[PDB]
Amino acid sequence: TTLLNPYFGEFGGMYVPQILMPALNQLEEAFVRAQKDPEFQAQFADLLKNYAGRPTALTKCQNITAGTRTTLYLKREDLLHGGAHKTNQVLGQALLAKRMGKSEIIAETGAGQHGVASALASALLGLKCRIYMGAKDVERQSPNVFRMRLMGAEVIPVHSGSATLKDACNEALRDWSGSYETAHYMLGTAAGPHPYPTIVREFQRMIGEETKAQILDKEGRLPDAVIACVGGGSNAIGMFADFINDTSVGLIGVEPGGHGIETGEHGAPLKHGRVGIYFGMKAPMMQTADGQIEESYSISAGLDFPSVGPQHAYLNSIGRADYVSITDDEALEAFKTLCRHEGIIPALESSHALAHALKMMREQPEKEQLLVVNLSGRGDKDIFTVHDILKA
Amino acid sequence: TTLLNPYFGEFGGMYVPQILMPALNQLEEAFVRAQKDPEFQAQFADLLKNYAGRPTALTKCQNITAGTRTTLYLKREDLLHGGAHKTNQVLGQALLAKRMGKSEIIAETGAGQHGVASALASALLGLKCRIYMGAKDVERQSPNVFRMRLMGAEVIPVHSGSATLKDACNEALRDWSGSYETAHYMLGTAAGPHPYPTIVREFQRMIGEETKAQILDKEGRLPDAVIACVGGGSNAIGMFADFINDTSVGLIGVEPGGHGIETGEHGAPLKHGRVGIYFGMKAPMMQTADGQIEESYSISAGLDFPSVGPQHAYLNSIGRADYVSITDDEALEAFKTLCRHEGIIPALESSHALAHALKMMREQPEKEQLLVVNLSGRGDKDIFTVHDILKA
Amino acid sequence: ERYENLFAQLNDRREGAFVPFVTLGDPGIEQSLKIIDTLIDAGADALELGVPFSDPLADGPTIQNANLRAFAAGVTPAQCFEMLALIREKHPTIPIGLLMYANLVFNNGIDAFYARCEQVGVDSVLVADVPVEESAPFRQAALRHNIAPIFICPPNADDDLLRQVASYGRGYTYLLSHHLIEKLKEYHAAPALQGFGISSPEQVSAAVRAGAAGAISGSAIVKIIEKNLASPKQMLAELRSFVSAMKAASR
Amino acid sequence: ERYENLFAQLNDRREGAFVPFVTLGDPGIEQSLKIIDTLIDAGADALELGVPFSDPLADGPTIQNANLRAFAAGVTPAQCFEMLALIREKHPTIPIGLLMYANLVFNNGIDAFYARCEQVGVDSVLVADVPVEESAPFRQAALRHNIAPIFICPPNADDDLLRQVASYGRGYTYLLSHHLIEKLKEYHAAPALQGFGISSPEQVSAAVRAGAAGAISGSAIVKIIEKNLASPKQMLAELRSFVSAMKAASR
């Protein structure tokens, strides 16, 4: 039994070894209590404002939409301390860990952005941070690995399996199964077993709440659509949440199309995968015909989660949200375009969301539409990757 | 003749070839008019808020001051779009360029931070940006050079002289002397010929204005001292400005001590140089006994300007502000300490200011003092440098 | 049915059961089939067999590598079921239990999975990542195909869970490594088999004395396999000596 | 005094003055002294000499390199003054003007600098980065030591500036490369010498026709030096041919 519904339609659940259920139940109870605690909310708000820098700006991008009837705003999570939206929820989860009397933090990371966020939050709040990262990702994310260590976190390479994010996820779970007594597993996306999809959404909900207040102030109306990239689903559900009940507002999630859906080398399980059970949840996933879990390919390291948050799968099924895909090349073009025309270097993850907004504009230039793209992070971290590519 | 005083005591002036005086006079007039134009102020405020992300947070650093009677706040210019305070004034200067009907931008840069700021501002405002950088700096700042090009700016390597910042400064002036008709020289610090020291201060003054409002709101009183690093003097005068008339508030500028003042390898002309005339101004400088201009050495690339803003030299002379120096090693320790205890990666430039605040605290642990350090920028750009060092 | 008969026969002999675990196809189909026959000939009262899975988030390093080795051999679920059919055709009474990960059971349909288990002769299925809270579809499909759904009784459990495991479990209750054993019997739970960390004969005797119907050992078994990869014969020899020792302790 | 006598003598001959510019010590002390003597023997009416400075922000590539070459030779201001003393001791009437950068004049004291100029025999000093607006201390010190302060009359100037340059300048007015020339004469300004970009004899004749007292040429001179670095003799030969040609045009 649980206090909150672990499912979003058929998706979600708590598919973890019996040994980990007490940890999940404890976390859910702590979360529910924290949500009704004015003191907890005050502390969380204080950190978000005075440490992280909230609220983040809502920038109107006038140059890129010239010659069309599209008005585009960018929610600037790239300006948040750390460089990405990941910081919002790690601060909340860190406070939850402390509320439960835990002194250690376990985190998984692929691109390293959530890892850095977990490390900085742990440094600030006096938590012993342990981070698992696929050996293959460690090798290609030396900068982030150093930042994590600089901030006092222990980075542990995972050589098992494909040595990537999914393998790091498994390692985190196996560790937590025998340490939940003193350590909290700070999951980095809106996926995994209940209560994580719910907690991450609630601790990222300020993205959409701020966007709504800001767009009403600037345009006097709600957007026609809000657009966000979808790796695990946290930045997107953070943007979508406050708009779910505003039926006139379209919710568009963008999965990575990699080299193209038809090549099989992509990371779009929601629309091109098959439902399965892994990482503690029932959700669409990248898997073989036999049922073995596969990796998600994308030029962007952050859209590597081989599955997707259960709430996104649910919103898709009932038609509330629409999901599409953007290829490596389309993301690269959007990245270059924003740099040159707005002076903003977007994360390659976020570039997928921008690329789709640009498509909506370009395909129907005379269609009047107010769009908001969630700029989940800055792309200073992708400068080298983009360089190697263009140079090639 | 001029509209405003080109001097701060004996320091300052307009020591440029006769050919460039009309450009300076035009700029001063445009600046004076812009300052009394509500429309210009509204536009500048709009960009600062909705594009750059102002106001920036004022973070209380509780972990680092544990066990002492020092309360330390960090003004978070590291959270500004671009990663440093440089963005504030480039937006203002870019608007000034447009106000004068100029379509091109000329900028000089050493570390590349001002260059990136100039490039992003030019991309946003539709200006053709040309940036001069010492060939030696271009070689060690490949990332920033690529960011500038990604944002559409033309980066021009300067091989003359020592091939560093001072040489880039000369090249910018020689270019502007024959193009001021269509191009504006966006100087990157509070130095150079009048009206630049004044314009840069005024376009950076919001740092101190915000800090005052924020500290009064949080502590109910003004700081005992505000501390900032001094390369050319822009981030420091931006912080100092609004506090100059608050006599109880100490103003402490920190110059780079490099390997130590006694080694001669430093960048502290204000307290260890000799007054001279160069780069259009009369100010203290790094120069040989014969009068040849020398370079400023520091582990931080941003504290490389071989002279210092004339207003700082003046404030020092009358005793309103005090200037000190911090060595490479002291800055490195401060950098590591902030990362590990507050989860913030500071620029190595800013680390000099933090290092002095830490010294003030550590030397007299039981002295009750409220300090504010200007965190001029983030240090993601210095990760590799710090790595190579610690690894060595 | 086979678990029922086994425990009844073991009870009439006042002895516990020793159940070894191994990954199917590790280090290869042929050698695995030989390993399994050796374990049986050595004294194994029952078998727990794992189907290679990409992300065994419930297994330590030893078994993680067993799966790695199995995959290196190209082992697939379909082949595992062919092996199971063969094993049953050779050994008609030994209880055979599978250790599965949820996606392999859910993949082509839960009912279909248990139906396949019944056709090849499997006796029980323990799905590692399916807590009692999410077990409904699984134990229902298991029961419909005469397969015993195995549940894990953790050490950090409580009365509520004990009652659930007792009413939902069949074949045997997987007791993670006394008082719980008594409670299970009080609630008519399936015979308890202690697992996790069992690597010595004394541990097997200890379990039986505590009131458990037997003990399960895997990593200790798998370690023998990995440390004799280059010596197929020696591997079997060592396996026989280990199982015989562990089995002897159950008497 | 020397400029006064020169222009008076050149006026009685209805001819303009040709003034070459070179960097002191470029490419070396010895060769520079020889270059200077060649320029004089070739027809130079006066000389404009630069003192090597670290940051010549008012010079193009050609002269930037002249300074670079001078520094490579270890040339210093003190040595430049020793050279100047020698040059004057050999040539008593030729006007000698210096092209300086403000810090070299300000370094050891402005008054001291002009006093040194007077003692070695210098006739004028043009400080590149000191506009009329900041010139007070400099022209005052110049006048106290009988040194002519040279001012630049830019093409983008106006009446106000013309009046200032006319009243503050001495020796000759440096006219950056007609109407201005007339205004200067109207305001009793020092004879005008056109500079910047003068590299051909026709330009020299053109300047004199416009009403200028002569023309100054530097880069064209320096280019001959840099293109004959490996041929000291040829360098001088070329210099002589160039100066003679440019001088001939002033007649």
Ligand SMILES: Cc1ncc(COP(=O)(O)O)c(CN[C@@H](CO)C(=O)O)c1O
């Ligand atoms: C800027 C940015 N935008 C988007 C995403 C995708 O995740 P989300 O779908 O949870 O929002 C990431 C994820 N990053 C994950 C997966 O690699 C991490 O461990 O750092 C990101 O860093």
Ligand SMILES: Cc1ncc(COP(=O)(O)O)c(CN[C@@H](CO)C(=O)O)c1O
């Ligand atoms: C974060 C940060 N903090 C401090 C400074 C020093 O300059 P300031 O004294 O003008 O404030 C710089 C300067 N950077 C100059 C000089 O190299 C540039 O061209 O980018 C900086 O980038």
Ligand SMILES: O=C(NCCOP(=O)(O)O)c1ccc(OC(F)(F)F)cc1
């Ligand atoms: O029996 C199996 N374990 C073999 C491990 O070797 P050993 O340490 O001797 O049991 C075994 C049993 C249950 C299981 O799922 C979960 F972890 F969730 F409980 C995983 C492996």
Ligand SMILES: O=C(NCCOP(=O)(O)O)c1ccc(OC(F)(F)F)cc1
């Ligand atoms: O006479 C000198 N110029 C030599 C350059 O060669 P040329 O092009 O032939 O004059 C000369 C004169 C003035 C000067 O300062 C400033 F630029 F500010 F006016 C710099 C060089």
Ligand code: NA
């Ligand atoms: Na995904």
Ligand code: NA
């Ligand atoms: Na300096």
